[PDB]
Amino acid sequence: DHTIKGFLYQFNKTLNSILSSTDQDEIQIEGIIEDIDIKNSNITNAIQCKYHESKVRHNLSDIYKPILQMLLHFLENDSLNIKYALYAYFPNEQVGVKEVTKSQIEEILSSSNFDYISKYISKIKPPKEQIIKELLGKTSKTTEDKTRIKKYYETSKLETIVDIDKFLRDHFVFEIGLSYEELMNETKNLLMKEGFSLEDVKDLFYPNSIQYIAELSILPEAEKRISSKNKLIDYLKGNKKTAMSRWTSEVLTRKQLLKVRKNQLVPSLNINSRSRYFIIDPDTIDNFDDEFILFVKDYLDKYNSKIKLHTETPCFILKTDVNNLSEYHKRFVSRNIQIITGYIGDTFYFKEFNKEPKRIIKDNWVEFKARISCNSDEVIKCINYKKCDDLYIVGGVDVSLLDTADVNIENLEINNFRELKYLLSMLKEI
């Protein structure tokens, strides 16, 4: 349980650092240098997280290995402007920056542990004997070699290549961290300052952020572990918006939702001179064949009846084959409705589909009142050539090949022609 609590404390510290950083700061979760690597414009901040709730008092030996690792990294990267930080929590130690003296650092380098001497102290303090260097260079070290190295490092005085004074003065800082509960509360309060309420932070934002940190921690690739405050905020806001939409679309009945959609669509439908295209899937509307002609007749009677005012010809695109289009053309010509399909036989003609109808105002005559065709590639090229004002999609037809840039798209979720007529304001009440 202690390891899990330490991992949670490290994740909370990383989240707090992400929240407290600016938009220009790049932070690497489980960074190359330490647990938290904050990359600013000129200074890189490396923070090591240690949890010591079970320790009554802070001891120098508790921070031997981390300080040795930081010293080794500083020795290997002295030319880099990296600020090394050690974030360790102790229940009985006052929260704040704790100074580490040069004598304490020298005491760390004099530790009798063989692992530390072989890993970090040897590189910090190179041995002056070639035999000891060869022993340290062995991949596998026997017990006699370990004892010899330990005795040599305990008895011999070796110079320190690492500039301890400069490291402590500029590139090192030790801070006594807050408790796990206090750190979590501070992180939640930081989430509060981002416009998020306590309820939202407690329920959604904090667990999602913790899961995001945990997921980024286990990624083997270092580049994929780089995150930022803006990215986390955007991810949380997107999740919140999706949850809001999903939860809101569960209370209102069908009629209220349809009324809301109709009120949304009225302003665009009130304009006399807009080009409106409809993409319809016949299999999502009940009794499409028996009712399609009357629907088009009513639509033309409402929105394409005034010769002087209504200037734009509507277009209807259907997910069907050419033979059904010919049958619909027969049924339209039988009812004295003039349409154009762009098909002569089986071939499609560009210059027929896209021609503008001729008007004689005195005779109240328009050459054709609507365009009706199928969703073939040529027809979609015709649509893309002459971009429409409003593009209504009925039945979830694949719009992947249409150019939808700067085109107002209105997805209509209906299942019968009564609903479609109600949404387009051609009926007063269902």
Place this chain on the structure above:
Amino acid sequence: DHTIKGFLYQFNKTLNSILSSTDQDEIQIEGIIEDIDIKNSNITNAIQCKYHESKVRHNLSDIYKPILQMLLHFLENDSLNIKYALYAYFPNEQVGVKEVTKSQIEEILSSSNFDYISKYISKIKPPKEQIIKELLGKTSKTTEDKTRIKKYYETSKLETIVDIDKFLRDHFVFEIGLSYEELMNETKNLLMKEGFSLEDVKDLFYPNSIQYIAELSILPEAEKRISSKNKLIDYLKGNKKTAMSRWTSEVLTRKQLLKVRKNQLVPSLNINSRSRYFIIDPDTIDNFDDEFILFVKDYLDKYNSKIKLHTETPCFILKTDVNNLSEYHKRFVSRNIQIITGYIGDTFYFKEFNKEPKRIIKDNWVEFKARISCNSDEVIKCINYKKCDDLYIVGGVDVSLLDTADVNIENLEINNFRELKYLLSMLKEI
């Protein structure tokens, strides 16, 4: 990463067990006996979780330690009706209950590892020599003592106090667990069976449950680690209800404020011959690039559509650079909207920007319908040269360089184009 994945797998298994258990079952996360301690009315179920994704084939030695600890606990608690379960995942092993024979158990007790022999095998198989008993009773054991104990337990045949047959028949069960992804999917499906949707579980319920399990696991008190399905369900439902109450019914303040602001702004928007200047910061509006053109088109359709009545031209000033202005110019020209930017290449021109548009009422032609430039000093000077009636500021752009003397300033606090359309009376309900 392997340890973190194993901890996540254990937490997912605990969550799945909690979901699958009945309302009368008490489950202790990180229980005294094993990882999962499900306490029924008369039978206590102990589950040990192991993750072995990196192991190609399951081996008996992989489960030596959990089985030995389990056998020792059963020996110490033979009078209790406790059923012990081993939940270990292996990629190449079929999911289901796997039988462990008595010969395999005897092989486990014959393991050559000194740690197992001294910890569990010694208590399961007591030594018949008092010297070995005294050596095992020592808190600190030297290498010679370890070697002597290992040799004695390897060479001597010792009887087993624990009833292996009864244990295997009644109090033991070994199951090959599912994969981490499969376990997570099953847990999410179980959460779906409680009345929660898939996305709701993914965004809120699953992270909340995982955080709850993690928080309960690290609790030092065993009693505080006791959980149940009803408690978790109630906690999740309370979190969902609080999130609902904070998200919905909070729109009242925003909608009422927006309605008040709209009513404030209506009187000046109904006059047909006013000059209106907009200063917009794109970073304060969601999806500015994808929605700017349609917003300008709608504003021109409502306020610059009547040639003989709408006589003034709007002016949109953006906090961007010249290249983005050129891109927007391209995009406007592609949509047959005539705008003037005042830039020929990279040089601003005073006389181009502030020329009045020509009109031919017979052909219904206006030379350009909008002015769209950047917030450069020259553009600000052009704005100051010809003073406007209404000045609208979006996003709080710096207006220190503008001559605001005797100018009606209307600051609008919005975060999306839908709200702006609502305020400018181009929509009737958000």
